[PDB]
Structure formats: C-alpha cells, structure tokens
Design a protein around this ligand. Structure first.
Ligand SMILES: NC(=O)c1ccc[n+]([C@@H]2O[C@H](COP(=O)(O)O)[C@@H](O)[C@H]2O)c1
Ligand SMILES: NC(=O)c1ccc[n+]([C@@H]2O[C@H](COP(=O)(O)O)[C@@H](O)[C@H]2O)c1
Lengths: 478, 480
C-alpha cells in the first residue's frame, strides 16, 4: 500500500446525512446498538443460491483502521471537532458542540466489535454474514453511524464473488458432463469489466471478488488490491497479450498481414486477436486456413485465440440454423473444428485442436454463458472449447437489491437491559449454526461457541486475518 | 483536500491488462493517436435526451495530476520501473524492460491534450463530449492506454448528472401546470442513494452529479467532493433531520409519544419522520389528527414531513380505487388534505397546508416519479405536494450502456501522415458546432475556431478551471 490517493471524505461525516440527527433521537440511557448484515433475497437473481463471504478484511484495513487512523485519530482534535460542528451549524443551524466526536478522538480507537463469516466460506440466502455492535456505552450512536459506510463498500465485493462462484458452479457442471477434466475452468471466466465499473474503487473490489473463483483477469488494480489487503503464496491472477480494434484498424483492411504481424510480435505467448474490425467471417473462412500452418507451428502454450466482438451471442458461437451461409449456420466453434484438428474425448464430445482458441467477451451474462454452453453441448462440442470475457454487464449491472443486502439494528441496550428492535425480521442477537441455519433469540449471555460468525475486529484491532490462499481453499471445500 | 486514502493501484498499470501489449502492436512510425469520448445511445433510457457534461475537472485533478504526480513522477525512477517490469514478467510471462515507462517518467508529465465540453453545458446523444490525443510522438500508445481509466471514472458522474437533469425537466414541467411557482423544485429530488452505491468513490461522483441539478442530498461525501474539486460561494446542498426505523422502534409501540418527542428535539427545523415501522395508516388516520394543533403551531419553515417506506409506490401516495378502506382509496396526499388545511392555487390545484409535508423514498425511479405526479395531477393536487427521495434504483442501477459511453480512436498519424480511422460513427478529428451537431473527417490543420469543445488539459496542466456555481448556471442557461 505504498501509494495514496487524495481524499475529501470527512471521517466523522462519512454517512447518510440523517445519521447526524439520530444520536439525540434515541431514548435516554441508550448504551449499545447491535446490527446484522444479511443478504435477504435472491429474487432478482435466482441463479445466486449461495453468498460468498468476501471483502471484510480489506474493508476493515482500508477504512476502520487506516482511514480513521490517518485522517481522524492522527489529526489535531480541535480541528476535527470544529470541522464537524461547523458543518452541522451550516446545514441545520443547530449548535452541536461535537463532544461525542471529541470523546471518540480521546479514546483513540473505534469502540466497535465485528464478527463475520470467514472469507471464502459460503452461506445460504437470508443467513447473516456479519454483525456489528459498539463496545463502550457512550458510543451506541457509532453503530448507527457506520451503516452507510459498511454497505456502500461491502455489497459489491460479496455480490461479485457470489456471481463468480455461480459461474464457476455452472462451468464445473458442463465440464463434468462434456470434458475429461476441469483444468480449463479457472481460466474460462476472464474479467473484462474494468472500464464499465462505476469507479476505480468499485473495479478493485468487484475484480477481487471475481478472483476468488477465477485466475483470468484484465483488471490489473484488482490483482494489486488482493496483493495489498490479502496477499498470496500462489499466483493471484493472469492474462495474455490481446489486440484491440484500434490496433487492427491502424493496420488497414489487410487483416491477413496484421495477424502475421501480431503473431510475430508475441511468438512465445498466447495471443488474442479481435477478429471483427472489418469482416469477421472473412477472417474465419479465408484467413485462418491461410494462417493454419503458422498457427499450428507455435508452442501449445502460445496458442492463437480468436475474439469475436459482435453478432448475436448464441449465433456467433453456436451457429444459426436459419442463416443464409454454411459458415453462419455453424458457429465459430464448429468452423474452428472444420479448419483445425480435434479429438473426441472419453465423454463423446469434440475438443478442438489446442493450437487455436476462442474467447467471447461482448456483454456476457450468466444467462448468455449458460445458453452458449448448452448450444455447444447440443452440437456435441466440449464446454472447454470456449473462454468467456466476463464484463460490466455481469459485474456492474447489479444493485444492493440483487442479493437484498441490508444492515439492520436488531438489539438495543437501554439502561442495562437488552431489547429486541425490529420493523414489521431478525430480533435480538444472532448465531449462525450452519451454512443454511441461524438462531436469533439471543442475549449477550448466551453460548456462541462454534458460531460460524467468527470474531474479526474489536476496539481498533484486526483479530483474525486471512490470505487469498485460504479464501480460495475455503471456497474449494464449499 | 487534506485527507488521504492508502492506494494499491500502480499508476503505470491503471488499465486493462491487454493495453500493456498494444504499444508494440501499432504500426512502425506511429506518432499520434486521437480519440473521442461519446455517449452513443440512449434507447435504454429514452428520457435522457440531453447529456450533461460533468466530472472532467475532478477526474483531471484527482488522477491525471495528483495520482500520477504523487505516485509516479514524484517517485524514484528505478523503483517505478522494476516494479512495472517485475509485474509483467510474473503476470503475463514475458520480459518488458519498461523503457517506455522510464521515458514517460523522464518527461515528468503526461504528454496529453484534452478538450471537453464545459461542465454544465449539455449535448444531444451521439455528440462527442471530450477528445484526447498525445502531444509527443514517442507516446502514441498513451492515448488509448488511458481508455480504461477515463471511462471507469467518468461515465457515472455524467450519467447521474444527466438523470438528475431529466428529473428536473419533468418536475419543472409538472410545476408549470400545477403550481404557481417552481421554488420547491430544487428540493424535490433528494439523493438517498449513498448506501446503495457500489463504493464510496462511486457515491461521491454520482452524488456530485445529482447536485448539479438539485440541492437536496443525504450523501455528505458528495458535498465534500464538490467542495474539494469545484467549490462554490454558498452552501452546496441542503438536508433535514430525519428519523429511521431503528429510532422509531427503539421508543416502542407508542408512536404518538415518539412523534411528539422527535418534534421537540427539532423545534425549528423541517423534520422527516418515517411512519411505517409498525402501522403506517394508524399514524396517518389516528396520530396525525391527535398531533394537528402541535403540527400547525410550528414555524412553516419547520414543517413535519411524513415518510412512508413500504407499499405500492403509486397506491401509497395517490390512493388505490380497489379498497376495503376510505383512506387506502384516498392515499397519503389526499389524506393529508383531509386532515390539514390547504389552498387552491391560481392554476386550480390543491396545495396542502404548508405545516405538513410528504417524502417518498422507497426504490424511486424516473418512471415511478412520473406516474405519481400524473396520479396527483389527475386528482387535482399540485406536484409541489410531494418530495422524492431518489436512491440507488435511480443512481446505482445503471451501466456504461445506459448512455452508451465509449472512447474510440478516430485518427492516427503515422510517419507524418494523418489518416482517419474508419472501423465498422465518427471518423477523423471532430468539432462540435452546436448542442446537437458536430462535424468530423477533420485533421489537425483545420480550423477549430468555433468549437464547443474547449481546451482543458495539456502536458500536466489544468488550463481552464470552473467551480460549481458556473456549472449550475451553465445548466440554467442550457435549459433555455
Ligand atoms: N483482453 C481483452 O480483449 C479485453 C479486456 C477488457 C475489455 N475488452 C472488451 O471491451 C468491451 C467492453 O467491455 P465491458 O463494458 O464489459 O467492460 C468489450 O468489447 C470487451 O470485449 C476486451
Ligand atoms: N434521510 C432519509 O430518510 C434517508 C436517506 C437515505 C436513505 N433512506 C432510506 O434508505 C433505504 C434504502 O435507500 P437506497 O437503497 O435507495 O440507497 C430506503 O428505505 C431510503 O428511503 C432514507
């Protein structure tokens, strides 16, 4: 973490505005507020049956430790309190001395206790993934206050990780039906989403979620994000040289020459060449046969990969039986089988010559991925014959309501006595008993041994840390 | 300003991975790459007929100036190289000496010129809003190298600004028929989206976009972002104290006492009270009548605002003719009219007693906003009778495909000869003549004299600066 970005967010005003008004609205003698973070529904995305825990450690380190230490506890105090009071004065014409902020500063740490599902473990929809409460009686308001920051930063990484897991589940099922092994699966979903994410910070946490199930990515800052907040012994992620449309068109319309030029620039690496700049099917039916000898001479670890980027997703890959030309009635995959070799595997499915490959990365979604694999299976082609560039239409096109994430207060302690709070509904303290069952009737005095929610952060300290190997291992056993 | 976040993103690697491979793929003697940033389509949101220029200045200062100066040009050259090369050698399995990174470092600035439409002006769909090219021939690769960073950071602020502009158009248009004036309009869309955005950084830029057309927000970090990157002479945005469900339930089931308690805590402020924690219609039909004298005794600038947060959006506000009850057929606004006073304005529409108000903020979208105002207009209620809490289903539920934002290379110079790129919209260099017309097929030799695209950044320097007052005034003039 040896770089820094300049920031504007005020540590004591990093919230929905109305949170600044709640402190004096709570009953007198309020002491503790306890809240839960739960994915409440997959109605908007029934294919996500499983929530991957991911992002907590990075969020704790980036914000609850470093941001508050760098920008609040490290800072003067008179300056920090004055900034807070002046903002309340301007916006409400209330005179809030900021004494609660001064007291927080004097403490020197966040009096907060957090438990969470270990990252890489999985939970059913509606099972809580994290709980938060304050540990000092003067700071009941702090649990309230932090709600906005917690879910603005955590629902995206868990949603992307859960999406990637559901992709991986489907890829494994097609591999079990149609392939002799699943060695291709870690590379079969390749994150393309970076430019289509809404900010660099969202690209980092989303792309990190993708990497919990997959190795392939172009989102470089996601790799370095994982390296900084998790670390790893094994390779975090990988990618390959690949051309873009501006490269192809800058060489003019003779794409046969361009292919030869690009393959000569990268003789010892896999190389993706986007193939639809001028005439996609001309490249397939004319240029690939002319290039065949050169292609099959390359080392197998340096295979040429064909990238279409236009057309109907299903027709381009699987063929369109209504089409006017033979090459279009078959898809890219069958055409590559026709031009290059292949074998028939033990399951009875066609596996194209490994000197050629195909990646499809135009608006890929789970549903489109699934339909393509079904179409190839129906034609007797193994699911390993294609890679998916999985982009912003998968990872950006979500909301907090995709998995129904909500942080809700479930218990308040007033004048020494714990009370359930709810709208009419989790009530009281919770304990996760298994991946699919929890119990909520609880008080702080109850047992809590073997809780799937494990203590993570307390009073300024990250008490439990993981690396990205453990996360991936957890997700393997899942 | 004066705070800092720790960062991991390597400046010389702030791109899609495959951009590191493009430099040697371009033709020999490549010298200049010219690219345009265009919102290409709005069928996914046809109500967005005007794209608001917004976000460039903050993007230039944050990333092209401070991030690269703080984290690249300031740093030891050998360390910055080496970090890049080691990364390429492991990730990707190839040897890149990083000489080009060293040369960029030695130059000391990004050899880039950017022109952009001034922020707060608007253009039609398919009109370019920004152009970028390199200024030194060794750095032909840098223009598209920056593509990933340019739109990961810019499509959201302009989409949010364009959405807010479209909301304001509709709200103004209902005001012209149902109200005597538009004094409520700046407050009628209040940003509720912060918790539903995908990161703090996205919340800041989206919420700054909302603020270009509206004053009301709860996204405090958007205020501080605008304050940091733009500034204004007066208060950037406004909000009000408001309860949430946990405060209501923490006081128990007697919500009558709670309402009265909260009102005493904010005696001289507008105050939103969320009203559906236990029994929404009980609060409306029983407790508000009991509270009436109390309510009207307050200063008018301290009106009580009722917030429903559940039920069908249209039925709760406008009423549902399918029934069982008086009150559910009438809806909230008409119920408030029955309980409290009102007047009939010059256009013939009912205006509720100004001591009571209503805010609806549960999954609001442009279409839901429009239908509610149609429902109120049909019942003869002025559109000023409702405030909208406009949240994540408006500002988070978008993609780069909402307005079709794309950067594309449209002109390349190779060995002194500039050629238009013709991939199969735009070809060659571009000039914006008016809000809805541009001309392309140009070269660097042509006359850019009447260009709506204004020179903005060159070779490390912000050449033109704006503040938020100018943006908002520009948007007034755009309207218009
Ligand atoms: N290595 C690559 O080929 C690569 C990487 C990222 C995006 N892309 C392309 O960029 C386009 C837009 O992608 P997204 O909007 O999903 O980010 C797509 O056409 C995608 O194929 C390609
Ligand atoms: N000042 C307020 O009353 C306020 C502010 C922000 C969000 N909210 C509520 O938070 C919930 C979620 O909002 P979003 O998911 O759109 O961000 C909604 O019920 C919203 O009404 C209320």
């Amino acid at each position: 973490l040896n770089y820094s970005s300049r920031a504007s967010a005020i540590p004591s005003l990093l919230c929905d505005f109305y949170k600044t008004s709640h402190r004096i609205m709570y009953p007198e003698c309020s002491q503790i507020i306890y809240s839960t973070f739960t994915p409440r529904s997959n109605e908007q995305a029934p294919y996500l049956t499983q929530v991957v825990s991911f992002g907590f450690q990075a969020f704790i380190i980036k914000y609850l430790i470093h941001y508050f230490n760098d920008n609040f506890f490290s800072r003067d105090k008179h300056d920090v309190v004055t900034e807070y009071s002046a903002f309340i004065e301007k916006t409400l014409q209330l005179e809030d001395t900021g004494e609660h902020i001064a007291k927080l500063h004097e403490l020197g740490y966040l009096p907060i206790r957090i438990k969470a599902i270990p990252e890489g473990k999985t939970v059913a929809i509606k099972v809580p993934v994290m709980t938060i409460e304050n540990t000092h009686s003067d700071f009941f308001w702090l649990t309230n206050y932090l709600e906005t920051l917690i879910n603005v930063s955590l629902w995206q990484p868990m949603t992307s990780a859960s999406i990637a897991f559901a992709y991986r589940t489907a890829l494994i099922k097609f591999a079990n039906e149609t392939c002799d092994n699943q060695e291709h699966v870690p590379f079969q979903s390749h994150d393309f989403s970076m430019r289509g994410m809404s900010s660099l910070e969202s690209a980092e946490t989303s792309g990190a979620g993708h990497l919990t199930s997959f190795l392939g990515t172009d989102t470089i800052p996601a790799l370095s994000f994982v390296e900084a907040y998790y670390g790893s012994s094994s390779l975090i992620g990988t990618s390959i040289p690949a051309s873009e449309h501006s490269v192809m068109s800058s060489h003019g319309v003779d794409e046969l020459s361009t292919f030869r030029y690009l393959m000569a620039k990268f003789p010892h690496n896999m190389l993706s060449i986007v193939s639809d700049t001028t005439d996609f099917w001309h490249n397939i039916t004319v240029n690939l046969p002319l290039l065949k000898q050169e292609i099959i001479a390359r080392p197998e670890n340096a295979r040429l990969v064909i990238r279409p980027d236009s057309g109907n997703f299903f027709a381009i890959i699987c063929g369109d039986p209504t089409a006017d030309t033979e090459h279009e009635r078959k898809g890219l995959i069958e055409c590559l089988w026709d031009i290059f070799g292949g074998t028939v595997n033990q399951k009875g499915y066609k596996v194209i010559n490994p000197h050629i490959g195909a990646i499809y990365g135009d608006g890929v979604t789970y549903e489109k991925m699934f339909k393509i694999l079904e179409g190839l299976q129906a034609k007797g082609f193994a699911s390993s014959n294609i890679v998916f560039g999985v982009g912003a239409q998968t990872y950006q096109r979500n909301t907090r309501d995709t998995l129904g994430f909500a942080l809700k207060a479930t218990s308040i302690t007033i004048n020494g006595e714990e009370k359930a709070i709810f709208k009419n509904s989790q009530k009281g303290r919770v304990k996760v008993l298994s991946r699919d069952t929890y119990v909520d009737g609880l008080t702080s005095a109850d047992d809590f041994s073997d809780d799937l929610l494990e203590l993570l952060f307390e009073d300024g300290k990250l008490l439990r840390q993981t690396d990205f190997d453990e996360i991936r291992q957890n997700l393997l056993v899942s």
